[PDB]
Design a protein around this ligand. Structure first.
Ligand SMILES: Nc1ncnc2c1ncn2[C@@H]1O[C@H](COP(=O)(O)OP(=O)(O)OP(=O)(O)O)[C@@H](O)[C@H]1O
Ligand SMILES: Nc1ncnc2c1ncn2[C@@H]1O[C@H](COP(=O)(O)OP(=O)(O)OP(=O)(O)O)[C@@H](O)[C@H]1O
Ligand SMILES: Nc1ncnc2c1ncn2[C@@H]1O[C@H](COP(=O)(O)OP(=O)(O)OP(=O)(O)O)[C@@H](O)[C@H]1O
Ligand SMILES: [Mg+2]
Ligand SMILES: [Mg+2]
Ligand SMILES: [Mg+2]
Ligand SMILES: [Zn+2]
Ligand SMILES: [Zn+2]
Lengths: 155, 260, 260, 155, 260
DNA sequence: GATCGATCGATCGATC
DNA sequence: GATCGATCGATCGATC
């Protein structure tokens, strides 16, 4: 089962969404692509050894999304990002149910489209968000508040 | 006419909810337990119609959501799967409230479920098939009912009573019950006629549920609402498949002997 | 001629599917249950021919796949192994649909199986040898039939009825049955002659299934289709191995005494 | 029948001692507390999923020992422990008849109070000690040597 | 007319309950024992009509069930099988109240039966064929009548009196009795005429139960209600099978000589 | 989870 | 009319 990426979707979110569509573990996707543990590293936003051309093309062969498009699920060259905290604009999620790579940019604190501060934890119960690959439903894993409803609590 | 026949068979395949006195007593009792946060346990036979009635009590209080605050869900209905652990149960609780889970330990799931459970102002925790979950989870549901003040209704077959009996606290805390009746009597005949009018939705051929039909259906269903539904739907579909406009005697005889 | 002899023995070793009234009744009943999503349980004796008939009902609806969407499989046929757990059963369901599994917990397998089961638009869940799987899995199959609206047919020997009887819900929900007949009578003689014409595929030597042959085969098979197949194939192979063009009386006597 | 914890008593030892005072199985205590199989997991020192606040408060409600005190029957945060081998200071047991959670700390090999190596099996017959929840009497289950007498064989 | 003949033979095959003075005395006595929770033992001959009268006393108090509470069953009627053990008896008690059993020890069955017996507010425990159950179960029924305060009626043939006589407590505790009469006399003639009017349900041919017919039926039945029913039904069916509209003398002679 | 584990429960039948 | 002795057969129940 193939999936079309959402605009701005992060690599972690896309990988997990592909895995859920195919009932794959991270190790299973890694074996399908021939790169093993690299998949789980990318899902946790760990890129000490940045994604190589061969690794991106290996994943591209499985998910049928070109390496160039996969690179747009990561920050451009020179744009610093953070693996933690995982962040969210609930108003964006209501429009398109994905984590955006921009929300991990170190320079980003406000959603430009919605002119709201982005969230660094659930505004109802304060639970931090899991890595985007594990965003199985669109709700806080603790209190079960929908990400879309968190828009109403954004400042 | 073929399109009409397909519509008829599709409608007959789909089940409906006829509101009768059994479900009326049930949601009256449920409202009474809800207004006092009294945790009870509705029990009954199998294939008798408890799940549908609890479902109706769930949809009647359809959560009304504020513009920018979590939707307030007064009644929570869950049917945990076989050997449901505590993590699985908490996942289900926070999933029904539309809060997708985050990967973590059992403590993390418990904390998130508690947070979202107080956030939405839940009044009822309806655990259908409450004979499936492990006894290491009954402590968790006990803690929920103890601290969060949510009336929990444990729904299941009579085996649920045996499951809770071997435990100590869950039996004492959950003691109020509402056994589902067999429905046999004149109320059963009223049920047959009401079903004929509503669920069958066939042209009026004056079947009227005659004495012979009542005897056949009594011998067939043995009082079960589910068996009555299955037999009626099977007879209607078999009559409509063979071109018969109404339901004849041969089809009831065939479905009755096929069952017993 | 030796190559022809090898071809004959290879063909006789391989079994075929002669369509007779037993399987005709069976897939008629299966189509009737499929059009209404009615979950039943076909039961019968051992070595009588239920597996082959369910197999035929499986191949007749060979899934037709779209150019770029999952193949739509209307009938799912499974034969779970001895003491089949829930994880094993889910693995089998998603494997038949040609979705290779991913390592994970039982919940992950359940979620993936549910996803692929709604994705392919399955109509039937044929669980042959349904007396093998554990009773902690009958809750899972109950949930499948309850929520996904898939008519489940539990196939197995009469021991399956005893296995489900000790349970509460699976017995009530799965009550419609189709017992496989013994076939003894003139229809049995028709079966012998039809088998001689088709399956044996030998030159016409006017055996015609005479009265003595009918008596021998009645004493041998006791009505079983499987025993009839085994005896006929053994006699044909023994006649072809010793140079006999047709099947003599001595070979039937030998195979009959070797059985009883 | 309620019991006061001993200072330093491990959660496994305390749970079993409470059960013996009330003729309860582990499953029975779990049902009384509403948490089922979790009790037996803790008795065998299995906490991959660490005790949650709700689980500790559920047990606290039955045994009438606050969750904070129950947490002191487990190692503090950051202190690694082992489920195996179960260990014993016999000189300590002679003074207070309980298993101490400190004896399962990975860093602990000597009793500070008694300046003796702690025991990882009976020093008389070499039988390993059962999980502390099953320490019904104060003696080796095999040779029946009292735990208090094992102090004389400690090195 | 052939359909009418089939209806007549089917009706004649089925037995009915004509209320006569024997059953009137019986349920009057049963009501008297019920209002005081007095455990007695109704005794009588074989094929005399005690089971039907106890059955009538059972159906007259058809349990009226509340909307959400167990149905209150005032009269419990049981007919335990041959060599009925305590587990079997408890199973039957809780099965009549429509509480399906759960697998367990004899103590578990006893506890569940006691629970459901106090739950439904039972007033009567009618043990028909009380000469079948083992004497290790009479202690259990004694305990039931002692602690739960339920008037137990032990019904059976005169062999039941011998069975209880060899025991010590069951004989003293269950001493009140109501022997069933032979019915011979003018009341017997009234019985014949009343049976002719109601049960035979034949067109009025002025048979009127003449003196010869009364003599034949007296020689045949020897006072038994069951023999009277069997002879009347056999004569009616034999007359209707041979085309005779009414019942002739030859058929009574044939059935009488066939009996004796 | 089978696997014993008595066990007692008739029973019956001759027979003296 | 006791009486004595063999016999086999379900059967629930603990138990490791
Ligand atoms: N109020 C109702 N209106 C219409 N159908 C009903 C109603 N109540 C029950 N049924 C019918 O009962 C059947 C299943 O009932 P339900 O699932 O509620 O059973 P249950 O009592 O919860 O039992 P189980 O535990 O065995 O599943 C279906 O055929 C359904 O149509
Ligand atoms: N329609 C058929 N045509 C040809 N052979 C058949 C047919 N039905 C059954 N058989 C024969 O029956 C035998 C096995 O039958 P099958 O496997 O279907 O049995 P079953 O009834 O499912 O029983 P079991 O549960 O004991 O396996 C084979 O020898 C097979 O050739
Ligand atoms: N009140 C009655 N009305 C009609 N028929 C009756 C009535 N009482 C008895 N009978 C007839 O008596 C026959 C059987 O009677 P019943 O079963 O009640 O016997 P019983 O006295 O309990 O004896 P047993 O212990 O030998 O079975 C049937 O033919 C039945 O029709
Ligand atoms: Mg249900
Ligand atoms: Mg088979
Ligand atoms: Mg009787
Ligand atoms: Zn936004
Ligand atoms: Zn020490």
């Amino acid at each position: 089962f193939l999936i079309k990426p959402y605009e701005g979707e992060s690599l972690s979110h896309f990988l997990g969404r592909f895995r859920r569509a195919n009932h794959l573990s991270a190790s299973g996707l890694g074996t399908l692509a021939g790169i093993g543990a690299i998949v789980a590293r990318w899902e946790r936003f760990h890129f000490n050894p940045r994604p190589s051309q061969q690794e991106l093309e290996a994943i591209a062969s499985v998910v049928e999304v070109d390496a160039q498009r996969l690179a747009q699920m990561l920050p451009p060259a020179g744009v610093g990002m953070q693996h933690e905290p995982i962040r969210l604009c609930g108003a964006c999620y209501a429009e398109s149910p994905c984590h955006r790579i921009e929300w991990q940019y170190k320079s980003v604190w406000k959603c430009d489209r919605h002119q709201l501060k982005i969230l660094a934890k659930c505004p109802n119960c304060q639970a931090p968000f899991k890595m985007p690959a594990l965003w199985e439903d669109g709700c806080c894993h603790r209190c079960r508040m929908p990400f879309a409803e968190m828009a109403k609590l954004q400042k | 006419d073929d399109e009409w026949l397909q519509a008829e068979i599709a409608r007959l395949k789909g089940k409906s909810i006829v509101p009768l006195q059994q479900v009326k007593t049930l949601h009256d009792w449920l409202d009474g337990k809800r207004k006092a946060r009294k945790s009870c346990r509705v029990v009954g036979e199998s294939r008798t119609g408890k799940t549908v009635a609890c479902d109706a009590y769930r949809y009647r209080h359809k959560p009304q959501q504020e513009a920018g605050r979590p939707p307030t869900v007064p009644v929570v209905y869950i049917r945990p799967h076989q050997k449901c652990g505590p993590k699985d149960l908490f996942k289900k609780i926070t999933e029904y409230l539309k809060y997708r889970v985050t990967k973590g330990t059992v403590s993390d799931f418990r904390d998130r479920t508690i947070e979202v459970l107080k956030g939405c102002g839940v009044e009822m925790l309806i655990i259908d098939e409450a004979d499936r979950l492990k006894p290491e989870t009954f402590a968790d549901v006990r803690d929920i009912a103890e601290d969060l003040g949510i009336a929990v209704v444990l729904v299941g077959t009579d085996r649920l009573d045996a499951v809770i009996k071997r435990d100590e606290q869950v039996l004492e805390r959950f003691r109020a019950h509402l056994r589902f009746g067999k429905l046999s009597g004149e109320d059963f005949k009223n049920t047959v006629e009401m079903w004929e009018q509503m669920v069958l939705k066939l042209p009026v051929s004056s079947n009227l549920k005659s004495k012979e039909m009542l005897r056949i259906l009594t011998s067939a269903t043995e009082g079960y609402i589910g068996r009555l539904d299955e037999i009626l739907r099977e007879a209607a579909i078999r009559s409509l498949s063979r071109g018969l406009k109404k339901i004849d005697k041969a089809v009831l005889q065939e479905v009755a002997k096929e069952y017993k």
